Enzyme design. Structure first.
Site, short mmCIF file in Angstrom:
data_model
loop_
_atom_site.label_atom_id
_atom_site.label_comp_id
_atom_site.label_asym_id
_atom_site.label_seq_id
_atom_site.Cartn_x
_atom_site.Cartn_y
_atom_site.Cartn_z
N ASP A 91 0.87 -1.19 0.00
CA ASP A 91 0.00 0.00 0.00
C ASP A 91 0.90 1.23 0.00
O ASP A 91 1.63 1.44 0.97
CB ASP A 91 -0.92 -0.10 1.21
CG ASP A 91 -2.09 0.85 1.19
OD1 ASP A 91 -1.92 1.97 0.72
OD2 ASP A 91 -3.17 0.43 1.65
N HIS A 101 -10.04 -1.84 -7.60
CA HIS A 101 -9.69 -0.62 -6.87
C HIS A 101 -8.82 0.30 -7.72
O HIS A 101 -9.11 1.53 -7.82
CB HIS A 101 -9.05 -1.01 -5.56
CG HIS A 101 -8.76 0.19 -4.73
ND1 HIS A 101 -9.73 1.10 -4.40
CD2 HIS A 101 -7.61 0.63 -4.22
CE1 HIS A 101 -9.19 2.06 -3.68
NE2 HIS A 101 -7.87 1.80 -3.55
C1 HEM Z 1 -10.38 1.19 2.01
C2 HEM Z 1 -9.15 1.19 2.35
C3 HEM Z 1 -8.15 1.37 1.26
C4 HEM Z 1 -7.22 0.44 1.02
C5 HEM Z 1 -6.97 -0.73 1.94
C6 HEM Z 1 -6.50 0.83 -0.15
C7 HEM Z 1 -5.46 0.09 -0.69
C8 HEM Z 1 -4.78 0.37 -1.84
C9 HEM Z 1 -3.84 -0.47 -2.49
C10 HEM Z 1 -3.36 -1.79 -1.95
C11 HEM Z 1 -3.42 0.15 -3.61
C12 HEM Z 1 -2.43 -0.42 -4.62
C13 HEM Z 1 -0.98 -0.06 -4.42
C14 HEM Z 1 -0.82 1.43 -4.33
O1 HEM Z 1 -0.92 2.01 -3.23
O2 HEM Z 1 -0.54 2.02 -5.37
C15 HEM Z 1 -4.13 1.37 -3.69
C16 HEM Z 1 -3.98 2.26 -4.71
C17 HEM Z 1 -4.69 3.45 -4.72
N1 HEM Z 1 -5.68 3.83 -3.87
FE1 HEM Z 1 -6.49 2.81 -2.41
N2 HEM Z 1 -7.02 1.97 -0.62
C18 HEM Z 1 -8.07 2.34 0.15
C19 HEM Z 1 -8.86 3.45 -0.01
C20 HEM Z 1 -8.67 4.43 -0.96
C21 HEM Z 1 -9.45 5.64 -1.13
C22 HEM Z 1 -10.59 5.98 -0.20
C23 HEM Z 1 -8.92 6.34 -2.22
C24 HEM Z 1 -9.31 7.64 -2.84
C25 HEM Z 1 -10.25 8.42 -2.43
C26 HEM Z 1 -7.83 5.53 -2.71
C27 HEM Z 1 -7.02 5.88 -3.77
C28 HEM Z 1 -6.02 5.08 -4.27
C29 HEM Z 1 -5.22 5.51 -5.41
C30 HEM Z 1 -5.30 6.80 -6.11
C31 HEM Z 1 -4.36 4.49 -5.71
C32 HEM Z 1 -3.33 4.44 -6.80
C33 HEM Z 1 -4.08 3.97 -8.06
C34 HEM Z 1 -3.14 4.00 -9.24
O3 HEM Z 1 -2.97 5.03 -9.86
O4 HEM Z 1 -2.42 3.04 -9.53
N3 HEM Z 1 -7.70 4.40 -1.91
N4 HEM Z 1 -4.98 1.49 -2.59
#
Ligand code: HEM
Ligand SMILES: [Mg+2]
Length: 306
Positions: A146, A219
């Protein structure tokens, strides 16, 4: 030049998130503390340098802003917008001030939180306190790495720091926080390949799924957003695991910084309300938001001059 707060921090393994409301009549005490928070950050952290990496980012909510300050407001500062999807809801919960405290050790976070809350006793009511810890290989409570696609360096400054679009508030940022609880029993019932289809990356190796296997409701697919002009709209996250084994509470504390709430809110809309191709973000089938607040984190010199 306006000096930003430590929004772009090096990697830290511990955090405290403190959200409080300002009691009626507490405004003057809050303004005094805001002008001292950088001095307290130095007092607590200096003697643990260079490995302590202690920083505090201070955020002010929309309603609190209008109680504390007069004159011009940040252009995008409003209360967190509740999202009522067909299946999933993003709740708005009260929060006037955010202290996002990070360090290489929880004790430095705790010492600074103690000094801040000591100064605010009788002026504020705690709404949320979360002690976050990162897994040794940057994994979250779902067992996925993450932070991987967070912007870095110049790309991160351009994504998070207010600039000429709101010049009186240049060097500020907008922080959206949401406390998520995970249904780990439901999650652990999926195969690894099914989990990978929920996130959009390979679990062990953290390689993004090809565009031809990555589901539309993954996601990574729903939080990948481009602007009208073809540029990636990015945010800076510092998601932190937290929980209580005895209460079976396993959570992700979400915090996203962006130079305008519009970027974070577009991502939240795609997650909670979905798109043509996707009913909603599959991560929400295993993740319940129990808080939701928006804060403006002013330039450091704004807080110093109160
Ligand atoms: C619910 C709990 C959340 C978890 C456990 C979570 C987990 C993750 C994981 C594992 C990734 C993939 C690796 C990375 O960080 O690039 C990711 C990517 C991402 N998450 Fe989440 N996330 C959560 C909530 C959110 C929320 C609420 C938002 C935005 C409002 C968000 C926006 C993003 C974005 C922008 C990426 C990168 C996407 C990309 O361009 O590759 N996340 N998140
Ligand atoms: Mg359970």
């Amino acid at each position: 030049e306006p000096e930003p707060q430590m929004v772009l921090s090096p990697l830290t393994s511990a955090a405290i998130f403190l959200v409080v409301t300002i009691d009626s009549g507490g405004e003057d005490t809050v303004r005094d503390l805001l002008s001292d928070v950088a001095s307290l950050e130095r007092a607590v952290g200096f003697r643990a340098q260079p490995d302590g990496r202690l920083s505090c980012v201070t955020g002010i909510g929309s309603e609190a802003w209008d109680r504390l300050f007069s004159g011009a407001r940040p252009a995008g500062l409003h209360p967190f917008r509740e999202l009522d999807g067909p299946v999933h809801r993003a709740v708005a919960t009260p929060g006037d001030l955010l202290f996002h405290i990070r360090a290489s050790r929880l004790d430095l976070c705790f010492a600074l939180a103690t000094e801040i809350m000591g100064r605010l006793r009788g002026a504020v009511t705690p709404q949320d306190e979360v002690h976050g810890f990162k897994y040794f290989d940057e994994r979250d409570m779902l067992g996925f790495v993450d932070g991987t696609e967070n912007p870095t360096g110049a790309a991160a400054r351009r994504a998070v720091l207010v600039g000429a679009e709101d010049p009186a508030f240049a060097g500020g940022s907008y922080a959206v926080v949401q406390k998520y609880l995970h249904d780990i029993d439901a999650w652990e019932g999926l195969s690894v390949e099914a989990q990978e289809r929920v996130i959009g990356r390979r679990k062990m190796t953290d390689v993004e799924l090809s565009d031809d296997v990555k589901p539309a409701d993954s996601h990574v697919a729903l939080t990948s957003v481009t602007g009208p002009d073809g540029s990636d709209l990015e945010i800076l996250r510092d998601n932190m695991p937290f929980g209580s084994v005895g209460r079976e509470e396993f959570g992700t504390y979400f915090i996203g910084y962006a130079r305008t709430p519009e970027v974070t809110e577009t991502m939240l809309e795609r997650m909670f309300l979905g798109t043509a191709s996707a009913p909603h973000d599959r991560i929400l089938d295993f993740s319940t938001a129990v808080t939701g607040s928006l804060f403006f984190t002013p330039a450091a010199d704004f807080l110093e001059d109160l």
